[PDB]
Structure formats: C-alpha cells, structure tokens
Design a protein around this ligand. Structure first.
Ligand code: SF4
Ligand code: SF4
Ligand code: SF4
Lengths: 393, 110, 156, 147, 55, 68, 193, 206
C-alpha cells in the first residue's frame, strides 16, 4: 500500500488528463524536494496528420482544417492559408475586404487573450474570471455567427481573392457598442485582480529569459516581446492595412509572468484602439449605406469598383496554385504563425508546413522550471497561452 | 510497467492475471476478448479466436516488445472478429444495453 | 546574391538558387561545411530561425533541410530574411545539428527527424515528440505505406 | 402525479399509437418505457430524424449507401426491415414490439397517419411518439392529434 | 402561396423581417423559404400568415 | 499501355530489396495484394496510388506494380 | 530598524484586507445583475441568418454535377446516378449525407448551382446510434424546426440582432429590430429628400 | 451468409418484475442517478472549449445537476470532447474503465464518432470512439452549439430513465481471458525524465 521513500529525486506525471484547458500534455517532471530539476514534456497526444492531409486537399477543401490549429482563434490561420497561395498568383486584394480581415482577425486576438486569461486564473485559484470571460467573449461569438455562420473556429470566412461574404446590415454599430462596452470591463478585471495580494504574490518573478536568451530559443510571440523587444510583424513586415492606424506596441522587461500579463492586457486594449479606428474608415462604411448608395445611382459609379467589392474574381476549386516557394507569416496572439509553401503546378500543394508559435514557445518549459516548485508550474504553463492543437505540426 | 493494446472488445496485456491484478511478467500475453459484451460468443468461434491469437503470437513474432506490435496483433484480431461476425458464426447481443453497431449494421448478402 | 557575395569572401563557396517570390534569396549550402556557414552568419547578426523543417524533393532523389534566417533588429523595417537549403542523399545519410549555434532547432529538428528520417548528427534528445516513440515508418515521406490498424479503417 | 401504475400500458394496448407531450428535459418518460418492458414488450427507439419514407425502412427492404470519402467507391448494404426483423428476433414469451420515436415534431401528418394505420396490420407491434410539449406527461391516441 | 413563388416576410416579431426569398417546399401549412443572399443559401420554415406574395 | 480503367496490385518483391522501401515497416498490411489501386496521378515515370482505405496515398514507381 | 518593520507589516496586512474587500464588494455587486443565462429548453436561442446546421435537399432540382463531392473536404455526399438514355440526362437515383461525418462548412451549399442544397437552423441533432445520422434524400428536406413556433419556448435574439446600445436579449419589447435601416428604407428616404 | 452481422435471438428473456412498490423505488433510483450526473473534465480539442462555454454564464449546465469533476472515480460521464489520436487512446480507455460501473458516455463532435474531417488521409486519428468504448449518445457537428450538448443530455437523461433495477446484470465484465508464452525480446524504456540532466545537453561534442 505504501511507497518506500528514499533520498532520490521524485518523478511524477502531469498526464494528458489535466484538470485544465491547456491541451493534453505530459510533463514527466523530476523534482528534488518540492523543487524542479527538469522535465521531459511528452507532447504528441494530438498529432492527426495535417501536413500530409494538405497534399490531397486544395485550398477551399483544406481551409476548414486550418481553423483547428489555434482552437481559440480560427482566423489567424485561415488568413495565413489564404495569404500563402494569394501572393504567388499576385491576386490584388481590395481595401474593404482587407479592413474586414483586420477587424475580424483582431477581434479574434481579443478572444485569444481572454481564453488565455481564464484558465490562467483558474489554475492560479478562483474560477470566477473563467465565468466572466464566457460572459463577455460570448458576444463576439454572436458577431461572428452573424457575419460568418459558425462561432469561434470553423468560420471559413476568408478566401484567396479577399473575403467570402460581405457583412450583415447591423454589424458595424453593434461592434461599436461592444467596443464601448469592453473598455469599462478590462478595468473591472483589474479591480478584481492585478493587485489582489494572494494573486500577485503567486507569480512575482517566476520564469525569466534574457533578451538574447529569448532569441536563441525563438519565443516569437509576447514572450519575446515581454523581455524588452519592440517587434511585431504587424509593423515590421507592414502587414496589409497597417501604417494607416495609430500604434503603441507594449513591451515589458522583467521577463517574468508580470512581463507577459501586462503585455497581453495592454495588447487587448490596443486591439480595441485599432478596431475603433478601422470601423470609421471602411471603403463603403456599413454594408447598409454601401448597398443603398450602390443601388441609388451606382450601377456604374465608383461605389461598385474593385476596391469597394468584398472579393475580386471568385475562384473555382481548380485554382491551380502556381510554382515557386515562399514563407508567409502572421503575428497571432501566441505569436508568429508561419507557412512554408512550395507548390509544383497543381491544386494539391507540395509540403504544406506549419510553423506554430506555441511549439517554439513551449520548448522552454523546463528552463523556466529550473528549480521553482511543483505548484507554480501551471502559472508558468499558463503564461505562454499554450494550445496543444497548435502543436499538431 | 505494462504494455497494452486496448481497443474495443480486444484488450491485450503483458502480465499474468492472478485474481484481478495483472502483474507484468514480460512473457504471458493475456487477452480479454469482448468484456463489454458487444457480441454473444459460442464455444467454437471463441476457440477460433484463441487459436488465431496463439498462431499469431508464436508463428509471427520475433522482434521487440513494443506497443506497436501488440497494437498490430489487436488489429489483426479485431479484423478476424469482423470475419467471424460477417460469416455469421457469432452475432450481436441484442440486450437492452447500448446496442451500438461498432462493427457493422446487418446486411443480407445479395 | 548579397549574402552569397558576402560569405564568398569568407573563403567558403555555396551554390545559389535565385529568389523565391518574396525577395528572399536561397543558397544550397552543402552538408559538410554547413556549420561553418551557419557560424559565419550568426557572427554577422543572423540570430533567429523562424523555421527549420524539411521537404521531400520527390520519391527517389533526395531530402532537404530548409532552414531560414533573419537579422531581427529592434523596431525595424523589412529585414533581409535569407534561407539556406541542404540537399542530402536518400538512404543512409544525414546532416549536422545547428542546436548549439542558435536554438529553436531542438524540437524542430526532432520532428523533422520524426517525419522524414533525417538524422541530426550532434543532436540531444534525438527522439520522436510526435508519433509514439516505439513507432517505425518515417510518415510524411512521399513513399510511406501505413499499417492496417483497426482504429485507422472506418466507422463501418 | 409522482406515482403511476400501468394504465399507460392499457391505453397503448387499446389505441395502438400514443403521443407523449413530455417536457423538454427528458427525465420523466423513460419510466413508462420501463413499465412496458416490465410486461414483456421489447423496445427499439431509432430517432425519426433519420427515417425516410417509413414504408421502406419499416415494411420493405431498403438500400443504405454508406459514406465513401474518395476511397471505396459507392456500395450498398441493403439492411433488412426494422419491423419484420426485430419482430422475429424476439424472445419466446414476447407480448409485442413497441416502437419509440424521440423527435416526432420533425415528421409530418402523413407518416403519423401511416404509423397509426400500421398498428392494426402487422399485429404484434405498437407505436409511441415523443412529440415534446406539456409540463405534465400526458398522452393521446395518434389517430387523434391529426384530422 | 405555392412553390417556386418568391415572397417576403411581414412579421415585426421575427428576425427574418423584410427579406425576399424563394419558396422551396410546402408541407402541412408551413412553407420553406430559401434566402438566396450573402454566400450560403439559408432555408427556414414560416407560416403562410407571416408572408406576403410579392411580385 | 497503362490506360483508362485498369487498377493495380503491388507485386511482392521488387519493393523491399531496392534501397527505397526502408521508410515504412518491414512487414506488410493484410490488404497487401488486393487489386484496388485506382489511377490518380502519374508524373511521367512516377505513380501515385490511393489504396482504398482512408489512410493516405503512396508514391511508387515502375518496378513495383502489376495490373491484376 | 524594528518599529519600521512592524509598520510595514501592518501596512501589508491592511492593503491585503482592502484588496480582498474590493473583490468582496464586486462579487456582492454581481449578485443583483440579472443572469445572462439562457434557460435553453424553455428559453432557447435563435440562430442567425447564416448559421450552418443541418443540410437540406430537394430531389427535383439536382442534376448530378458531382460538385458536392468534388468540393467537400472529405468527398462525403453519396450521389448515385444511372444516366438514362433519352438524350443525355443524368438521372439521380440516390443522395445521402452522413451527418456523423459532415463538418458543416457548407461549401456544398456554396457551389450547388440550382439552389437545391441549403443550410437549416437545426442544431438539435443527436441519436443513440450513428447509423441513423445517415440521412436519405427523403429525410434531408424534412421541413426544419423554426424555434419560435414552439409552444413551450421563449426565444431570444443574439447580440447582432438587438437594438443599438442594448446588450442582452431577455426582457425586450415586442417590436425590436436589429440596429438601423435597411438599404431599401435609406434609398426611399434619400429619394424623398 | 444470409443475414450478415446478425442478431442472436436470445432465450430466457429477462424475467422483469411487476410490483409497484419496487418500480416506484426504481423510478427514484433512476431519477437520482439521472439528475446528478457528474461529468469528467476530459478535454482534447475545441469540443472542450464549447464544453467550457457550456460551463459558462450565457448558459450553464450546473442546472439539471451537473458538476464538472476532475477525477474519474467520483465521475459518472465522459463527454468525449476532441479527437482521439492513436497515442492518447489508452489514456482514454484507462480513464473509462478506471471508473465506477454505472457510467455513461457522450460523443460530442465528428472527430470522435467517425474521425470527421480526419476520417480520411490521416494516419494517427481514431476513426470513431465507438471502437474504444460503448458510446451511449451521439451528437454530431464539429464545434456543435453547446446547447446541442444539452439536447444530448436530455436524450441521455431519457435513457437513464429507460433502465431497470433488476437488470444490473448487463453492467459487469465477463473477462474471457487466456495466456500465451512468447519471445519478443523486451527493450528498455526510452521514456523517462532526463531532459536537461542528460549528458548531451551539457556537452558540445568534440
Ligand atoms: S451540387 Fe446540387 S445539383 Fe450538384 S449533385 Fe449536389 S445537390 Fe445535385
Ligand atoms: S457541409 Fe462541408 S462536409 Fe458537409 S456536405 Fe457540405 S461541403 Fe461536404
Ligand atoms: S469535431 Fe470539430 S470541434 Fe470537435 S475536435 Fe474535431 S474539429 Fe474540433
């Protein structure tokens, strides 16, 4: 019945069946008296074979798979799988569909940070913010279900030449109402947390990487930006509809869980600052006024031109992506998603690849556990916004 | 520690059941065909399954003791059970439990 | 190219493939002097990888180990963003590991090994993260014959 | 109510086809199914949203074409009837073969009438349909509730 | 109302207010309107009294 | 000659001695030689084979095939 | 050296008590705000104008183009035709979709030219067996549910269909409309001044 | 070879009971095990995120008595939530079987009743959890509306009521078991700790 103690480091299994949300993940961890020397993270419990499924599936056939990498935000990857063959063919994208793309994708960033925040606090004690995010993150579900069909994930709202479907009528002013309702509540969270001692004393200085030590290990997302690095692909790569908006890229320098939390929580406000600044600048405004102004006179006018349409020429399922390889990337919540696409001459690609940020960010789990504790693990594991679905490639 | 292949209605281990424990021995290879009673077994077809298992371990196995290999054995048994259950030796249980047709629905063989 | 003419002056030569539809250039660094090229580039401020995994050029010719490099200056404009390719023969051979020069190569090379059979001579924890470690087969090759497992067939 | 005897079984043996107006919680109807099984009847629910003509799946022999996914080009299975096969696979002391349908709202008047008329023909066979509704489990003959 | 005939909705207590749509199928008094619009064709059952047979 | 309606059958032996079978496992599927290999792509000299069980395609060559 | 330690001690204590009472008052404030719960079986929620539930199917409009299979990610819908010889017409003999496999991407709906194949607002699919989800041609049309026309439901609109400024959808007037004017009204307004 | 995959035609049928004092107590028994199903927090993919939204306050499932429980032993239900790869499957059978006997299953999603989208061209997915455990209720749809899960729970609750108390014989395992000596050369476990303490991480080779 008993276990026969001995003066050796203890090995314990934090198996697939976590009592949490942070995927299914093993962490065969060895400890020296409620310490941590290291751990072998046996990920692999969710490999279903994307990168070889993407070779008998054309673009429109594969795009619903794409939204299962980041289960939290299924548009930072639909966007990338769109942008990959879109650049080879050189298909011009309008300003309207690209502003819609920006808006929806940044709204997904908000969702992603909320779903990071919830279990981050549940693993660190109380469950109430888990209930306060699905009280709030549930409104953008309704937004998406209005614009696209399904909610978080499986929208498959994006297409190669732009966006699949123009917006609904009453979407824009309602998104404004949400935008205005959100800012009073990111403050109510900071009333309930961010100074509660039983919380901030739990993650004072656990975890830390230097600037250049966070660059060997390539922690592309906020972890790299939570260690004194002003770097985001929305600005340095000049992603599609940017340099047209105001910018304040957050940065911390402690490298610890506060340096990540503050960055995430300021990003989830800068995102709203982008969204409010985009809705006031569409080529056409709300779809109501746009369609009305078209039908009033514009059977030929400039409110029916290419830059005001939600897509260019709608394509067939025989688009036949051209030859030539390239690497596309997008700064999502977890960080840089990336796709190395090659193509030969045909609809089926050749070596579809995914470069997820969660994979590289989750490389350094054990260094962060270089002698911390058994019970401050989840606080670190909850810091990366680990989505094991994004480690299926 | 154990090295098992747990499909439905085939569970294979690497120990010796003494009373309900397993006790991994590295050479006994127990089996537990259809614990959940998805199928109604006779004395003959079950012996055919037994003989398939015996002449599938001994006749073709001389490599390592991975779970890959036991899983392959379980797959061959779960296909042999399809064969027995199609040809018509054994059949479903019909009892007022789940009644989910994991193997197949009934055909007529036209 | 610019990186080509640069490290040509460092007394080690490598082929050039042109560019890949994004302004990036490509060079076929050979297998043996791969570490030297990588060390010269890391000395010349290429400190971040952004992808490593491989592709199969077809069923019979050779494998690849496509790296990618970047300078990654703080608060920057569009950087140079080069990559290098390593054609390796099919049956036996392998490549070295770039884990010690800069990291991100540990699990990336571990999964490239897992899915293409590319050994990495000088790699720690050279195991299978995906694909249970007792597995055999090298899945993502173009010539791969799956087993007849029961939980891979149908919902018949 | 809070306790009920076996008058449901008498109503069913009399009418042949009833229609339950249970609440949308599905917690207070399976007991009557038990009261039926406590007599000798055997049940099979098969979830009407999924039944077709209801003359090909119950009486006649029909062709089910499974899901091909690029592999295994189109093929049929020809499963036998649901009412002349389970009715013959009964135990010896079997009073009859009742038929339960969970979602009856999705069906139409015509097949309600068909299931009702099918009780008289094909004798050892009864029908029940869970047309959701009332906050107290009450029933009604299925020849009624239509026309 | 009969099949193949475009219609619209006259019911302020319905989210599908003032949409034009083609009738698809009719069974037992309730008619399946088909809203060709946007991208995905939607199909919904309305009563005959909620509708208005527009030209 | 290989044209329009005929399915294939991996043979037995030209596969696993020719230095290019070393990817997959030594032993073979019990669906080994059944003539269901539908015509899907030929790249001049290469072949691509379905194997009608929902488990992915395979890229083979001349020496490994027979037409049933 | 020692008095300052006790003062910092008491200060930490008081700040902790204050930051606990803050959340105390917050949670005691949340227990007057109305529940945003959706008491589903009696208080169901209305899907949108683009939700992708069960697929519909007509038998008379199909022409057997095989686009549905050639476009589905997994080639799911089972079209079966025989090509009668009057001149050229493909005769459609059977059509099914296994909804235990279907993904509800509705590309099938998107590329059907005849407007035969559509999405319905049925999200209440469930069985005790998965061989019942394989819906036949005569079990795919089947006239969907229409939540509102249910005698024991109190329907609720969702955040995109509530008046401007409104957030919840529980206690609403019986004449509420979405946000703003339809384009027809705007056109007839600008035309009439 | 006349009716493939046939039914078995049982005898000695069931010998049910008929007295009222026992069947009312049976109704109480079933109502009690019914209205307090305690799930198992079993998450693998976005079906779990919809189950999390089902926990939430837009529509909870705390009513009709469901407490998300963390261990199997206290639990009563595995709402199978996500894809089951071939490396986590024994970690699901060892959660199902390692649980008290009157236990039920719900299979939410299409990636776990036929493999869904991964039912084709995938080499590591289990194409149906119904070939790992006895699924009791199926609900389709990659991510389904989490209120559809409550339809599945309605449909499961009207199946717990469909049970009887003198019928618990169809609730145990028969264990038709054997033994076989063999020769397959056991190998050492290559799955331990030793991720940073391994000599090769603290050792640039020569
Ligand atoms: S796409 Fe439309 S016309 Fe073509 S086969 Fe499908 S239902 Fe018939
Ligand atoms: S919804 Fe998607 S998977 Fe289902 S039939 Fe349509 S295209 Fe195929
Ligand atoms: S069925 Fe859909 S929601 Fe569930 S795991 Fe698969 S893709 Fe995700």
């Amino acid at each position: 019945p008993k276990i026969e103690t001995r003066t050796e480091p203890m090995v314990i299994n934090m198996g697939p069946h976590h009592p949490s949300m942070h995927g299914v993940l093993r962490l065969m961890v060895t400890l020296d008296g409620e310490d941590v020397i290291d751990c072998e993270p046996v990920i692999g419990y969710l490999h279903r074979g994307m990168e070889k499924i993407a070779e008998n599936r054309t673009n429109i056939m594969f795009i619903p798979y794409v939204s299962r990498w980041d289960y939290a935000a299924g548009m930072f990857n639909e966007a990338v799988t769109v942008n990959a063959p879109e650049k080879l063919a050189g298909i011009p994208v309008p300003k309207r569909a690209s502003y819609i793309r920006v808006i929806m994708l940044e709204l997904n960033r908000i969702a992603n940070h909320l779903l990071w925040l919830g279990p981050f606090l549940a693993d660190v004690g109380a469950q109430t913010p888990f209930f306060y995010i699905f009280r709030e993150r549930e409104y953008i579900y309704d937004l998406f279900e209005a614009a696209t069909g399904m909610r978080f994930i499986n929208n498959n709202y994006f297409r190669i030449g732009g966006v699949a479907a123009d917006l609904t009528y009453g979407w824009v002013t309602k998104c404004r109402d949400f935008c205005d309702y959100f800012l009073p509540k990111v403050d109510e969270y900071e009333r309930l947390i961010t100074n509660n001692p039983i919380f901030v004393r739990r993650l004072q200085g656990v975890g830390k990487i230097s600037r250049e030590e966070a660059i060997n290990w390539g922690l592309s997302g906020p972890m790299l930006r939570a260690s004194g690095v002003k770097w985001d692909l929305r600005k340095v790569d000049h992603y599609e509809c940017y340099d047209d908006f105001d910018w304040d890229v957050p940065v911390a320098t402690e490298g610890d869980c506060l340096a990540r939390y503050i960055v995430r929580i300021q990003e989830m406000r800068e995102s709203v600052k982008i969204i409010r600044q985009a809705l006031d600048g569409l080529p056409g405004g709300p779809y109501e006024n746009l369609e009305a102004k078209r039908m009033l006179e514009g059977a030929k006018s400039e409110w029916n031109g290419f830059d005001y349409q939600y897509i260019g020429k709608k394509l067939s399922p025989t688009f036949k992506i051209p030859k030539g390889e390239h690497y596309v990337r997008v700064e999502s919540g977890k960080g840089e998603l990336g796709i190395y696409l090659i193509g030969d001459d045909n609809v089926f690609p050749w070596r579809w690849k995914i470069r997820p940020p969660d994979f590289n960010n989750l490389q350094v789990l054990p260094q962060l556990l270089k002698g911390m504790k058994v019970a401050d693990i989840v606080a670190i594991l909850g810091s990366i916004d680990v989505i094991m679905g994004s480690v299926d490639r | 520690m154990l090295l098992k292949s747990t499909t439905r209605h085939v569970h294979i281990y690497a120990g010796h059941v003494v009373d309900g424990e397993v006790h991994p021995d590295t050479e006994t290879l127990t089996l537990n065909v259809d614990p959940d009673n998805e199928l109604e077994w006779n004395e003959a077809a079950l012996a055919k399954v037994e003989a398939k298992f015996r002449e599938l371990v001994a006749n073709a196995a001389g490599e390592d003791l991975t779970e890959y290999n036991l899983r392959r054995i379980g797959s061959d048994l779960e296909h042999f059970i399809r064969s027995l259950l199609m040809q018509g030796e054994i059949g479903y249980n019909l009892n007022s439990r789940v009644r989910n047709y994991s193997l197949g629905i009934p055909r007529v063989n036209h | 190219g610019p990186v080509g003419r640069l490290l040509q002056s460092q007394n080690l030569s490598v082929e050039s493939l042109g560019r890949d539809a994004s302004g990036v250039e490509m060079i076929k660094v050979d297998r043996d002097r791969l570490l030297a090229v990588c060390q010269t580039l890391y000395a010349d401020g290429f400190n971040y990888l952004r992808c490593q995994a491989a592709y199969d050029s077809g069923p019979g010719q050779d494998l690849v180990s496509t790296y990618h490099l970047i300078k990654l200056s703080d608060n920057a404009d569009r950087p140079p963003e080069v990559r290098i390719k390593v054609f390796v023969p099919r049956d036996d051979p392998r490549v070295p590991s770039v884990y010690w020069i800069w990291k991100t190569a540990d699990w990336q090379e571990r999964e490239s090994y897992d899915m293409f059979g590319i050994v990495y001579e000088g790699h720690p924890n050279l195991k299978r993260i995906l694909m249970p470690e007792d597995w055999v087969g090298w899945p993502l090759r173009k010539d791969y014959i799956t087993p007849d497992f029961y939980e891979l067939q149908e919902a018949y | 109510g809070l306790l009920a005897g076996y008058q449901f079984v008498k109503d069913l043996e009399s009418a042949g086809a009833l229609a339950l107006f249970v609440p949308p919680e599905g917690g207070f109807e399976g007991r009557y199914q038990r009261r039926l099984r406590s007599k000798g009847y055997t049940t099979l629910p098969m979830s009407a949203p999924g039944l077709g003509d209801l003359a090909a799946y119950l009486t006649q022999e029909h062709g089910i074409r499974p899901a091909h996914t690029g592999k295994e080009d189109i093929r049929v299975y020809f499963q036998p009837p649901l009412v002349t096969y389970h009715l013959e696979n009964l135990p010896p002391n079997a009073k009859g073969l009742v038929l339960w349908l969970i979602d009856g709202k999705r069906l139409s008047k015509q097949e309600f009438a068909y299931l009702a008329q099918l009780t008289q023909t094909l004798p050892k066979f009864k029908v029940v349909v869970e047309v959701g509704g009332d906050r107290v489990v009450r029933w009604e003959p299925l020849a009624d509730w239509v026309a | 109302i009969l099949p193949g005939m475009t219609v619209k909705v006259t019911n302020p207590n319905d989210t599908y207010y003032q949409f034009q749509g083609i009738v698809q199928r009719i069974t037992d008094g309730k008619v399946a309107v088909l809203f060709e619009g946007g991208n995905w064709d939607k199909l919904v059952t309305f009563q005959a009294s909620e509708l208005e047979p527009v030209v | 000659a290989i044209k329009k309606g005929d399915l294939v059958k991996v043979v037995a032996e030209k596969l696993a001695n020719s230095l290019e079978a070393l990817a997959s496992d030594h032993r073979y599927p019990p669906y080994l030689f059944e003539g269901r290999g539908e015509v899907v792509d030929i790249r001049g000299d290469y072949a691509q084979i379905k194997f009608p069980v929902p488990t992915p395609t395979v890229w083979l060559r001349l020496d490994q095939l027979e037409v049933a | 050296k020692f008095l300052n330690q006790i003062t910092n001690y008491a200060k930490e204590a008081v700040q902790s008590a204050k930051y606990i009472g803050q959340g105390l008052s917050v949670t005691f404030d949340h227990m007057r705000r109305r529940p945003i719960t959706v008491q589903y079986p009696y208080e169901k929620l209305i899907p949108s104008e683009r939700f992708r539930g069960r697929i519909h199917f007509e038998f008379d409009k199909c022409i057997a183009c095989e686009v549905c299979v050639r476009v589905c990610p997994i080639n799911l819908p089972v079209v079966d035709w025989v090509f009668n010889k009057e001149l050229k017409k493909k005769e459609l003999k059977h059509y099914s979709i296994d909804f235990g496999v279907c993904i509800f991407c509705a590309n099938c709906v998107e590329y059907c030219p005849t407007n035969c194949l559509s999405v319905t607002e049925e999200y209440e699919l469930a069985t005790y067996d998965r061989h019942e989800l394989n819906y036949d041609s005569v079990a795919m049309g089947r006239i969907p549910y229409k939540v509102t026309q249910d005698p024991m439901v109190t329907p609720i609109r969702e955040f995109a269909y509530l008046p401007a400024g409104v957030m919840s959808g529980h206690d609403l007037p019986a004449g509420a409309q979405r946000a703003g004017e339809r384009p027809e009204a705007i056109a007839n307004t600008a035309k009439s001044s | 070879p006349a009716i493939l995959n046939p039914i078995a035609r049982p005898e000695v049928p069931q010998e049910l009971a008929e007295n009222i004092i026992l069947t009312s107590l049976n109704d109480v028994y079933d109502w009690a095990r019914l209205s307090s199903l305690w799930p198992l927090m079993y998450g693998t993919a976005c079906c779990f995120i919809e189950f999390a939204a089902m926990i939430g306050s837009r529509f909870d499932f705390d009513r009709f008595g469901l407490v998300p429980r963390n261990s199997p032993r206290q639990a009563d239900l595995i709402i199978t939530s996500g894809t089951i790869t071939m490396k986590m499957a024994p970690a699901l059978v060892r959660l199902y079987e390692q649980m008290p006997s009157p236990k039920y299953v719900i299979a939410m999603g299409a990636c776990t009743i036929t493999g869904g989208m991964f039912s084709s061209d995938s080499y590591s997915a289990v194409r149906g959890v119904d070939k790992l455990i006895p699924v009791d209720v199926y609900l389709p749809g990659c991510p389904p509306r989490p209120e559809a899960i409550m339809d599945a729970i309605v449909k499961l609750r009207k199946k717990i009521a469909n049970e009887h108390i003198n019928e618990r014989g169809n609730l145990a395992q028969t264990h038709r078991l054997f033994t076989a000596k063999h020769k397959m050369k056991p190998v050492p476990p290559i799955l331990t700790g030793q991720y940073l303490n391994a000599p090769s991480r603290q050792a640039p080779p020569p």
